[PDB]
Design a protein around this ligand. Structure first.
Ligand code: CU
Ligand code: CU
Ligand code: NA
Ligand code: NA
Ligand code: NA
Ligand code: NA
Lengths: 620, 620
């Protein structure tokens, strides 16, 4: 009965039928995005209406359309034709990936380049990569993919070990034309294989690891109701899934005595960009928007018990649409479980004689996606003490190139002749805040050093200062680790028992933001990534930090255009957008398959409760 | 047979007998520190000689002594009389703690101050705190403790809830004189209790937590030999224990094929300081040097199975000396166990069809100490992939004061009338490096941004730069999170298969360093805490960043004096000293007992291996 329930297979089938009967889903049409719309603000009238947003691509060259459908009422609410040279192209379709390699295999320029290198065309895999927007006037308004080549010596070979450097092609995937083939010179194809299951590379497998058995003999402590409503250790929330964003958390609330207290209305990773820092023209255009261009949710893995998720696991299997409107289940795509998390609180008191220890635990909600060579795990954690944490885990195989003799300032060497270009992995968390309700504000908190002198005669004092962000034009903030800078989201109309506004503190990891020159194409298209924190006034249509149509958009969409409205954010319905990421200079140890590296953020209560919220946790 | 074995009860008994027969341990003498000396550099001749260092205090006022003893040969090697006004006082003795409260209970000024507040002297507990060095000329060369008072309403009451503000006393614990009683005015004693086991405060305990069972049905994967030698998943090390530093890790090495490769010769937390930032004269002198002044190892907790350490636990029970030279065992003082640590590496490859997942694990070595109101957990972690990590966990009860009406810039309010002064918890990790042997160097690595222009026409390139630290005078470094600053310890004479020097990268958390005015007493005594990273040339007698005798030392000892030697550190036997810490503005949620907060650092391999070191990890 919940309006936040997961989309069902029947709902997706109904959308398909509604679109087809409306004449909007003929043989030339493809669904590039389909997802459920959240309830509008103030749905406290039970006026339940399940609406879906659909992006419809046309493979014959006709204008694409954005369509909204009500499955409740069985009607098309609106259908708009899109001018893609203006507002951006639709996300890449899975079926366009194969088109790139197939088209290049019959192009005389491509074949001549492979012949010069003595490569058999049947062994050459082509990575189909998003195009961005650069200097090529003929690409405006066309759907372009760019291809980089790798050699597969045999069907089970890791092609990433054998990049074909000095060669790139651009393909129009609608007209099926190869627009440009660029060959800047012959590089040796690195010859060592990178097959991490080959016994000659692994050596004999270890026999020293003894099993670790994690079980819950009475079952887990959380309950799942309505398909996706979670209750666990005073937390309450709904787990959503969207094909673009992946796992979305709705209605995060905490049961404080008799009150269910809201904290976060909606939490998601709303964009992620992987910009490459190699100035070679073979790769200098390379920037993945995994969320906005490719849709990370549709490439979610089925997670295996005992390998991907260990313990007493509860799975959700979300349903998405394929390109024709048929429902497709991602079996075991979301793992949920609780984990022991060490000591929660401990004290041995000499004067009272009391020894006290309690253990911590966390609830884990996770999924994994694979886009080409990289694999990413997205982890949301809820802790007993009110902390909320996000962690991204990056693994997979690094993107490779030739390593030029005489070295490089922008590429690491991984193996003889084998390079890995420098890059970043940057995420944007969109946190539609609801600290004790919707009247919230953000304060920036800095440590304050004090000078020795009157009123501080021993020079030991230090303090802190808080600055309220009152309008969007002043709410674009940078980290400052040296001053211990954090941000507090508070509710000025809800006070704790000390008459102070209740709040939550955002702790960032303070990693570098986007490194590209601010005049670059990527800085314009990923402007969110140039600053650590943005605060906007909530609006229904301001969903993504990069805009709705990221693929081949010329720039400026999303957060820079939203904040130009300069709206009041002091005690209002607000959204926090936090940029965080990893700067990856690949190491030899990242090859031939990369051990996990992590990055994230957390929010801790700051006078939200009237005392520690875990005094009622029992012993042993 | 190992020279790195733990001190035995028999060794300590022999030291006691040697000291006594030498006439050095009469009825007026107390052992303030006793510990084993590490082998000197180049012990590759098996010339085994177990030597102990002893600090001997005299309760009658005679000069203390530093003594070195050989238990192997049964002789006193050297005995030096100490001039404590010059080189510092000896660490605080456990038996001096009770002296402070007992002396104040008969002092007319103390009793008059308690009478004005209608407090019964029998209910007033006194926290005995280290004195530091300030303006009081009469304290030079005397052993002083300062006392702050708290009310215990009944024997099981948490006295921390009832600070008696406006009152402080100074005590000479050798002459048994109260030197000063300072009363700056009557503050109400906060009345709410902070008894976190009282059902009226906790409410009914949760019945919702279901058990998590962690077992190892075939036992753990690590072996312990020789009492304290650990082998686990290619790691090899020795676990030492010292009464001042606590757990010390020796001879950290990694079995890479047929080679045992050294990484770290000795790792320890060599100092920790807790400076308070309240300018009130009641507390403006307050700075704990838990390691150097109190000796954190002697207050180690006995860790309980299922509560403190969960899983298949192996315990060590180190032996220390009491004040009379008798051996005392700290039963179950060190926990060792392995833990599942999620996904290690994962990739699903479209072209090869291979799906690959491996799980991570870590070896944990931990102990917990309690000094007054605070409790600290020290955790060392070894990971499958070569990462070494340290984590400090802070919990216990925060130090309290009155909360003044009209507020404070330097104190948080926790409850009606109850404050908690701002403070920091700062640690110094001493890492005697041995990356593939003893010829090491440190490079500072910064991200480098590049301008759009020739050779970077699309403005996407970024790079990095490394700066070798060649002499101690240039090896005092600050963090810079915005430039992604890290430090690499490498061996210029040991190269990986790509002919690059092998190395390890130190990743800091980039938290604020010491906030006090640089002209303050604490900045002079804890100069190590003002900078993130120091590198020195190894020397036998340069053990602690604060010097040997921290208590009431006037300043400048330790690292600032060591680096004045300006020694060559470019490809030499070097020691890295890393400062890291937490800046604590107490929150309501920290009361009445504080949930754990953490801080730490890690070291990751950087071209140390020729490829990923975990290719031989098996599945499932
Ligand atoms: Cu990467
Ligand atoms: Cu603290
Ligand atoms: Na445009
Ligand atoms: Na909001
Ligand atoms: Na002195
Ligand atoms: Na060294």
């Amino acid at each position: 009965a919940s309006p936040f329930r997961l989309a069902s297979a029947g709902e997706i089938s109904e959308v398909q039928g509604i679109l087809r009967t409306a004449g909007l889903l003929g043989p030339e049409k493809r669904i590039a995005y389909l997802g459920v719309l959240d309830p509008a603000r103030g749905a406290g009238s039970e006026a339940e209406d399940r609406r879906f947003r659909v992006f419809i691509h046309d493979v014959s060259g006709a204008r694409p359309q954005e369509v909204t459908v009500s499955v409740t009422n069985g009607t098309v609410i609106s259908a708009v034709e899109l001018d893609t040279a203006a507002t951006g192209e639709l996300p890449v379709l899975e079926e366009e990936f194969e088109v790139v390699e197939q088209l290049l295999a019959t192009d005389e320029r491509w074949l001549k380049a492979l012949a010069a290198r003595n490569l058999d065309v049947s062994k050459v895999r082509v990575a189909p990569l998003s195009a961005g927007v650069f200097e090529y006037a003929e690409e405006r308004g066309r759907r372009i993919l760019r291809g980089l080549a790798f050699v597969q010596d045999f069907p089970e070979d890791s092609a990433w070990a054998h990049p074909v450097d000095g060669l790139v092609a651009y393909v129009d995937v609608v007209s099926k034309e190869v627009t440009r083939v660029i060959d800047t010179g012959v590089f040796p194809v690195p010859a060592e294989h990178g097959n991490y299951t080959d016994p000659e590379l692994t050596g004999p497998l270890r026999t020293t690891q003894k099993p670790i058995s994690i079980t819950q003999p009475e079952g887990p402590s959380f309950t799942v109701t309505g398909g996706n409503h979670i209750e666990w250790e005073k937390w309450s929330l709904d787990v959503g899934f969207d094909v673009r964003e992946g796992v979305v958390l709705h209605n995060i609330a905490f049961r404080d005595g008799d009150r269910l207290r809201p904290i976060i209305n909606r939490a998601s990773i709303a964009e992620m960009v992987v910009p490459y820092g190699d100035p070679s023209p073979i790769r200098s255009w390379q920037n993945y928007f995994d969320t906005g261009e490719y849709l990370v949710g549709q490439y979610a893995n089925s997670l295996e018990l005992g390998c991907d998720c260990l313990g007493d696991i509860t799975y959700l299997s979300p349903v998405i649409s394929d390109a024709f409107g048929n429902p497709r289940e991602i079996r075991n795509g979301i793992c949920m479980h609780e984990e022991d998390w060490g000591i929660l609180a401990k004290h041995s008191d000499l004067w009272s004689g009391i020894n006290y220890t309690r253990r911590n635990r966390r609830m884990v909600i996770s999924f994994f996606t694979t886009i080409g060579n990289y694999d990413y795990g997205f982890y949301w954690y809820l802790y007993l003490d009110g902390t909320i944490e996000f962690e991204a885990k990056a693994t997979g195989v690094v993107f490779t190139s030739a390593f030029p003799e005489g070295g490089s300032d922008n590429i690491s060497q991984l193996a003889p002749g084998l390079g890995a270009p420098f890059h970043q992995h940057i995420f944007s968390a969109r946190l539609d805040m609801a600290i004790d309700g919707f009247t919230n504000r953000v304060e920036e908190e800095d440590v304050v050093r004090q000078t020795m002198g009157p009123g501080n005669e021993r020079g030991n004092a230090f303090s802190r200062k808080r600055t309220v962000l009152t309008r969007e034009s002043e709410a674009v903030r940078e980290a400052d680790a040296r001053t211990g800078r954090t941000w507090i989201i508070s509710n000025p109309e809800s006070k704790n028992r000390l008459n102070e506004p209740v709040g939550y503190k955002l702790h960032a990891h303070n990693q570098p933001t986007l490194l590209a020159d601010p005049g670059s194409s990527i800085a314009r298209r990923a402007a969110f990534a140039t600053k650590d924190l943005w605060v906007t006034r909530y609006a229904d249509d301001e969903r993504y930090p990069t805009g709705d149509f990221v693929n081949q958009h010329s720039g400026g969409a999303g957060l820079p255009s939203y904040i130009a409205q300069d709206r009041d954010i002091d005690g209002q319905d607000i959204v926090v957008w936090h940029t965080f990421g990893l700067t990856h200079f690949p190491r030899v140890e990242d090859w031939p398959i990369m051990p996990v590296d992590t990055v994230g953020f957390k929010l801790r209560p700051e006078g939200f409760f009237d005392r520690s919220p875990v005094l009622d946790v029992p012993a042993n």
